[model samples]
Target chain A: KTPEDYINNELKYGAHNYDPIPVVLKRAKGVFVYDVNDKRYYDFLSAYSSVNQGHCHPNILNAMINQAKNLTICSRAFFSVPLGICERYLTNLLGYDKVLMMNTGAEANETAYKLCRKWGYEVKKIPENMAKIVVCKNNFSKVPYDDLEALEEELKDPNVCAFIVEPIQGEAGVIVPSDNYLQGVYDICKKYNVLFVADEVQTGLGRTGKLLCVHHYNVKPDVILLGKALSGGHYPISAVLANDDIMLVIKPGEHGSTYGGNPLAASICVEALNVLINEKLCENAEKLGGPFLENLKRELKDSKIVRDVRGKGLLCAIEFKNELVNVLDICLKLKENGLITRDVHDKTIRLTPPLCITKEQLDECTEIIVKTVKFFD
Target chain B: KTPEDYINNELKYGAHNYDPIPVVLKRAKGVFVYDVNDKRYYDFLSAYSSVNQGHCHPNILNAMINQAKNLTICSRAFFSVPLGICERYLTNLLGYDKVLMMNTGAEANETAYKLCRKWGYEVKKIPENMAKIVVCKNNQFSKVPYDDLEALEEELKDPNVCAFIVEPIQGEAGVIVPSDNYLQGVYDICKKYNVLFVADEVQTGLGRTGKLLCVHHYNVKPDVILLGKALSGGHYPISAVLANDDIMLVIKPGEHGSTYGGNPLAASICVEALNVLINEKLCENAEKLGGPFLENLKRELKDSKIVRDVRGKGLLCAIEFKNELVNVLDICLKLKENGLITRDVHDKTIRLTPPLCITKEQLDECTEIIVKTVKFFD
Candidate 1:
């Protein structure tokens, strides 16, 4: 009749591919989700920061529902007006010539990777299938992220097709790089004529204060990957944004998806972007992010369990000294109180909330964190 | 003007990765879609047979919208009732130990591939990345014939071919249905060589081929079964991979993930979609109607010089024309004029996959339109 049943059912029948927190979420609204017993906790993680429209935003929900009742996935075998409208809006707003829609952030990233390789062979005249992509120590021919000196060494190779990076490094515990780092990499990649692909899937869409996290520096990536909060977490809509020279490398019959450019995805995506812009959520994030971090650092500086506090906009984290105390237990303590978020790497807890989170709510959340950590420490 | 305008805008601003048939879709109901000017056409394609429940299915849409308004995605950081509901229902129905949900056909396929390779290295005692590399070293293999057990064993004997991903009915390659014993042959051969038989049933699963799954016709259970397209009933994007614990547990939690893979909205819609198929007996409907649909298409187009072959399993079927003598484009345009919408798979093949809910009368009408259109060239 309660939470354990839901949790047990999932573990029994579902693939053991994820370790979700024990809380069984039954309903969610802006900045808060309710457990099966109707106990509400502030949704600190926002589905890994995918619900930037603050969970079931009426504008987006209305748009999605209306589209759903009338029409949905007509496939890319035919033209859809919603698809064209979304394409034009996304490209024009993001300053790209074209967009190739896919279903997930990973798919969009894969599309960019595929496009880079095809362009490497056809346009850059690299040897077939031997094209290399540089990454930031990301399990590839990777260079240390924040170090342009090592990056230039890899980009010097003519066969390096692209350099992919997460502008704010969301999965790496909200790590921020040096201010001049992205612009330097962009310049270096441009010098070598290699494509620069920004995987802003997590940090983009005003979560990082700028519309895109790349905007924090004076750089525009050659290809931009966006997903997650693209439809306000209502749907799975992802895209690869690039100019014609890069986007057109893979032509018809080479790639497509059945649900890629569906009408429902199109309508919800435009509304999600609109809500982010019109509601001034980016301004909210920028206004409150510094204080949240400042207060976070101030409160945790003296605690023996805490090691460091770092953040950019709403995407912030506290890397605890977990060797002494288990970080997952601390997360459990945080959930026992009111806030609900998990550790990223068994050492760091990401405090990425919805962008619509208020300053008062953030201050209260900080107090909850301090209370929980003080109890544990 | 509006259709042309939509197409031009698409070509101008969108990646021209698809050559749409120049039809601007506005709305869709079960087995039918309308244009901006309100001209209706039978939805023969059904979003590539993802809508086995038909378009805008009320049951699926209601569950989806209610869930959308109440709670959509809480991510996998916490358990969701809808997620558990879907996983339990699907595994029970599909007769698998567990199921992993994803949002697209490609993502599901990628996950299965990763799982197989990881299992190969860890459990199967193969060297890392060497599960499929032993055969590649030989440099002597194109695709073997579909039903040839010899070709299959000759390759599986190498033991480097870790997983054989073959469709029970190859829909895109002109709906190629192999000999009766082909699936059984591959299943036994893979078992003999300790290889995993992966069924790429993205287009043929969910009652598309008269059977609930195409593999069921041969009574063979593949190691890994991938189902997409029809999973969401064309209302949402959802896919799943079903397998036992040995294969499913190969990839661990932190190693592989997708943000929206198993969201609440997806879970709710998929569960409802699956029930629609089962309760409505859409599989029985496919079996009941597809024989006539195929035979009628064959007899109707037999005299036509353009169409060289007609093939299908159920609602999933196609007509193939001689590449030298026929322009498949003109026949498709004529069909479009008569109010049926499908797509050409290649220069010589036009694939027809209608919703499983279409009545025999409706399917016959579609056949007449297809025949009427092809006779123009004849």
Candidate 2:
């Protein structure tokens, strides 16, 4: 039975938090996964761009196996060999001087928050308890992205330590900002002496066709949050890359994770980054994405259902004309017809296919989506 | 070259978040880990008891291999096989009806807090804000045994929650009973029709001690609380907070989440951990072994340095002494010299948390410490 069958059972007993299409996937390889009925579908969502190398890669899995057999967690009470190697690897890869390992993107962000707060008090000479962070409200909550007006009030005093932003808001349905939006934030942070932290959780690791989203505008963020595709969907590994000034201030007891630096996760991430560059996934997305978007634009040019289309690399979306348009139902129908996509915030369906996907495969997905759109017409 | 080497590098590059002993571990299997120099040491800390399954139990690793090749994390966007199996397994094991997932004990506790506030507003009909919780303070500061009162105070009020405790007369190094001379005070909140009670058991769990936990003594349990330990030891997993609808009613969509759920990794952890608890018989060791050890310690030791004696359940023992006479690290250094691995926080106190896989000879090897402490003139 596929996980979908198990999920159906979960729905029978568990909370109704989500509505997933009825496709039971048992195993995944490269760019495709086989469902319970044994139909192979090209995975488009990449679990929100988590499995950039596709699911269950052997090279990464081998590291997981060998490390699982060895020392898994020695806790921070003692020294561990693999954790440091991974730290150095991540630091060098991202060009950051220091790194702290965490298990999820949220926690990584949490650590970054804690770090910035401490920096405010210790380095910036702000009072201890009143440190604040200026955030882009239009980033995560676009109906008001964290309620910037309220956040501004929250940081009205010098207690403000940093300003955090996602260069390209992925979870907020891949919302791209107006040109100069990110640079505007940096300018504000510079004026205020507030460190600029980038929440690149879904937009990092060569996705959106760049080494990182901040690079799109050639900006250097004080802290960078990364997760998902970092380990190539092989495991839950999240990290925060910080330059010397911001990172050097976070003392040891200030933050940590028991499994954050486990060797297996490190190995997979190293391999995942390797494959991304060696296989030219970024270049592929740039080469393939332009044409792919053109084809999509060409196909949906006259469709009344289409509201907008925008993205980079392969991270694109199709926003419907209305808020309550039931994009989930459309995706469910598409799944039944042997295709899979996902809805973000109701009206937008984000399409982030496997980085290894080919032109022919993109054509097939585009074909189904074009037909699905016309059917809605 | 070794974990110790990496730790040294981390110390140079990162902040001093922890003070781990001088041993560097490179590889592990079962209950033993070999250092980079190939010196095998029995794992006693278990990453503060998160690795109850011993190191690298083959069954769990095999499952990880098989699942990694198939499905990893699809997030909540779609269904993955492991999350369902884990939900069934955890609920079945813990005797709960529903389960929500997160990556760390702190996150889970955070979830539980949000859930409590939500339930307080919706079910209890408590006023729009005004939600409070009752928590017991730790005997000492700066230790992982329980949540610190100061840190709790920092984050407690923002979401309109407060922590109520009995009182503290004077904080001694290792001895402070709740003001009423009772070990654990029962602050009645149910009568007020307001606050929710949560137990933060981050450092206790998985049959490490002779008993399941020290809290089981009162035959009372918190509505929301859980423990972390060899929760697959440094295996890259975290767990905390088990609750029912008395508290679960408040959590709604987009309110709480951790991305690493229902994946192959966490399921493998739950399965392997529970299997170890059942097969390894760690609970029995705590019950039978901890008492005699406590008695032997009380009877045999005659050091003026030891200010107090305290212990509970298997392997969770502590020796609190006068701060002036012996610092915690001094005793740890002595123990390390005697080839024993232990933890000492603050001054003149040390904890014995060797892995459950330890043999009595290994336990007896620690006698040198007992002799040294009792016979010393200083």
Candidate 3:
């Protein structure tokens, strides 16, 4: 199909939840994705960091192909070889007692919410139907970023099940909280007997210069949620990790997902985690992120449209001074310059390249950002 | 890993959500699965009917592999090629104005609930946050076991009732099949009240009940239908919710979505899985074999001391026993030792859902084993 055909098919049949850049990606490998017209652009969004192991890394692909050829999804009614291996690999790697696999990030988050509420009711002795969990919006509770006092005040309600928060807040324009803010929240939740659920779905699995974003704060949460990069972009796999005390609250038939612990998801996630560690993606992100952030700040500092540049690891964003310049226009211009990124809100552009991106690829991205901003009004 | 090792690892690291029949399956093909010890058994459960195309069907696997090599998950933030094709294929096959893709049956069910609530508030003009959807704990209200249409009528009379969700046959509540008139009565009541009739066909769908959908048996159109399990032939996680424009349009973008919902891999696999369903004529097989199979089970266990009842629709059958005489778990264990695998619910119920492709010869063997085991217990 032609580029327009591909684009039109999506528009005709799919939901219009997102307005993506007008690039019909046909195939991708590593840091570059080739559009339908065979035009290649450096992948900057990494499918929101779902491709941290890079697009279709040979190892992850081999894991997927081999597993699909043998056994793909045997529902949890019976045990499969890969599911056990994945359970062991992920729990040991992340230091969690048990893992509950789900399909998507939202489902994983939903699972966490259910577990927390049930734990609140059954274990914490919260009144039936009164077990409340605070979310950022309607999900948990909305606590302002970096505010421990506000969190403690909310926890004082005693009915709060858990405080589920994103360590770096990816969709909130990659907002990096104060350095000690997570540590403070952890302490407060501990003091008040509230479960500290870390939503590492976006900020986990070495995207944030650490195994998990919460690790940077030296805090151990009671529960952790993971997704996106868990499958290395080869599959849709997400998981929630917790100890027996919290997880066992959800018994058989009380809750479940049909394909949650299927063999294909397990195999892909096990291989993806191995790829993340064996390839040293976390250390690479830690080393390269400093330079990438420095280069952006140093080069874009003099621009009148630039307000601030901040990020952790490869996950970074740039805020514009005002709405005078369209962020989407800037992203489209970057696409033209052979760099693919996305704009969030009206003033900020998020750039999260694959964790496997190289020094040269990083330099190319930096150059495009510099050139695109310099020419902008 | 050894069988014990696999079992131990799962118990050690995985959440205690399922108490599966003690079998560590290592390989599977059409209608049969081999344990780690290489002992093969007829796969009666069919991965809870997720493997209706039989295990590891080549066509679905090829679709999965070809798509994985090309593109797997690009997130719904951007468009992929296969997703659009899947959307068109599913919407057409299911006779719906639109389709929404999700990863699990629970997610699909959850999406349906969210859509009904939103449609109630926006289109049906129900008060916001007060939209209620009734579900049948036993089949439509506390009726006379699927007889009381009047009870269903009163339930739908509430102004806040957005929809009523029912399984064509309740799978977990012990494979209970409803009367022929039950679905028609509920649908009529729903139409009179102008409320949506949502069908949770996740288990009874995909030819499990001798038809493409259990609703087909009643010849009634539902406002929303939930499908999963057999969507991918047990290859990947995929489920779909189909509805017309009036009900579905209420769910806008950003209101609902999943990272894996519209990915190319899931889309291709679903298309291939559906194609297998059509090409194989498994539905006709289930329809032809259902009555004979049920008759055999009923006859063989007629005067057995242990069994209380035997009933089913299509290949989905269940055997209930007198709780005083024998436990279902013991019967399930005996069946396992006798070369069949099934699961027990509560204390005296067994749900048997063999793959739809199982031949009559294979099912005869299954029935003989069940009968022999029950005779021994008697």
Candidate 4:
């Protein structure tokens, strides 16, 4: 089918929820995705770090195909072989005692919030329904990037059960916190006897420089929310990890999902985790990300149109100075130049390529960004 | 590995969320599931109706594997091929103007609630956050007995009422199928008042109840319909909410979203599931077998000390015993040993929901097991 055919079909039949890039992806492999006409583009967005193991990875796909043949899902009402294996694998890998599975990042985050509330009321001895979860202003408590005092002030309330924050604010223009910010927040949470929930859905699984973005702070959150690359984008698998103290508050019927902990998801997730570790993606991101970010800063450091460059590991972004500049136009231009990256807000563009990207590939992507920015002015 | 090995592993790692039967199913096909030791049993629960197409159906698996090799998920920020095709097919199949997809049944139900609230404030002109959704005394809100028309009417009397949610046959509550007039009465009352009516057909829809939807039994239309379980044929977690523009338009772009929603894998699987449901004539089989199946239980177990009542709709049947006679779990265990699998709820009722694809021979086998189990106690 032609691009127009696919785009028109989507518009006519589907709800108009998203305004996607002009390109319609027909297929994808390791580091590159293709359009209907067989034109290729570097997949810089990596499906928002969901494809960190890269698209259509053979191992993840094989796990899914193999498991689909034997058994797929036998609701949580019954036990399946894969569910137990995956539960233990994920819990141990993340250094948490227990893991609660869900289908999406939003569900995982929502579950984390629910667990915090229940723990607050039951264990923290807060009155029923009086539990408060301290959040910043936007979705999932948008505390400012490095404002420890603001977070501390919010935690002062006795009824506050948890303070949830992203180790790196991904959707808020790829904002990285100051060095000691997360560690300080963890300390404050510990002192106040409040649960510290880290929303690692976007920033976890080798997307950032470490296995977990929270690792950079050398502090452990009471609960960690994970998604995106949890299954290497092969399936919709998300999870919430916590110790027994927080997770056990949710009893058998208190909260559950029909498809959560199903065999197929469990099988796929185990393979996804193995791929991340076996491929050394975390080390790859750690080594390549520093040079990649430095290259972007060096190339566009003196450009009149550029404002700043920032990122941790493969998660990076470039901010343009003028609000009048159409970031979408620049993105469209970059798409024409065979690179794919999406702009956030108005003036900032977030770049999260697959962690499997090679240095030569990174150089080519950087060159495109420099060329596109220079030509824009 | 032995069944005990699998059980031990699950108990050690997984949260103690469910107390499942002792059977450790290693593989499943059609109406039969094989445990780790290759012991065959009829899958009566059908994964709570999620596996109505039966486990590992070739068509559904092919659809998933084929789509996985091509493209799986691109987030909603972009369009993929399978999504649009599946969307049109589902919306048309279900007779709704639009459909929004979610992963789990709970998320779909939650989305329906959120949409009702948004529509109440925006279209119905109710105050923000003042909009109330009325549900049976279990979930989001409470409206006492299922058949009580007066109680339903009293609840709908408030202008703040946005929608009333009901399961055509409450699956978890011992498969309680309301009286035929009960659904019709609620529908008329909902229309009399200006409140929207929401039908959570997650368990009852998709041929489980002898029709495409349970609302068909009463010839009533709901403003919103939530579907899951059978939507993906139990392969993946897929659910959908279907409503017209008037109610659906209230949901703007940013109001609700999920990373896995509308992905290509989910879309392709759901379409394959619907195709299987229609082609296999699962509904016809359910309709034909439901009465006989219920009658078979009643006829054989009528004189048994353990049997109290047997009731059903389509293939969704339940056995409820007098509270003091015996716990249903023991009977389920007795049935399990005879190669039949079912689950007990509320200590008194046992739900018997075999896959819709069971043959006459399989049903006879199932009947013999149920009869022998009850006769032993009698």
Give the best candidate by TM-score: 1
Give Cα-based local distance difference scores for all models.
0.85, 0.65, 0.83, 0.84
Clashing pairs in 4: A136-A141, B44-B353
Q: Which of candidates 3 and 4 is the stronger one according to lDDT?
A: 4
lDDT of 3 by residue, B259-343 (tens): 6777777899999998999899988888899889999999988888778889899988999999788877888888988988887
Backbone collision tally, model 1: 1
**Which stretches of model 4 miss by more than 4 angstroms?**
A121-123, A127-130, A139-145, A156-158, A245-250, B139-144
TM-score, prediction 3: 0.93
**Candidate 3 on A1-87: residue-level lDDT in tens?**
887897776555544445667777767888888777888888888888889988888898888878877777666667888888898
Q: Write the per-residue lDDT of candidate 1 for residues A266-322, one digit (tens) a residue.
A: 989999999999999998998999889998898888999898899888989899887
* Leading candidate by lDDT: 1
Q: Could you tell me which 10 consecutive residues in candidate 1 chain A have the lowest summed lDDT?
A: A136-145
Let me know the TM-score candidate 2 reaches against the reference structure. Answer: 0.87
Winner on DockQ between 1 and 3 is 1
Give the C-alpha miss distance for residue B300 in model 4, angstroms: 1.4
The model with the greater DockQ, 1 or 2, is: 1
Where does model 4 sit among the CAPRI classes? medium
Which TM-score value belongs to model 4? 0.94
Ranking by TM-score: 1, 4, 3, 2
Index of the highest-DockQ prediction: 1
Q: What is the lDDT of residue B63 in candidate 2?
A: 62
lDDT of 1: 0.85
True contacts kept of each: 0.87, 0.59, 0.59, 0.58
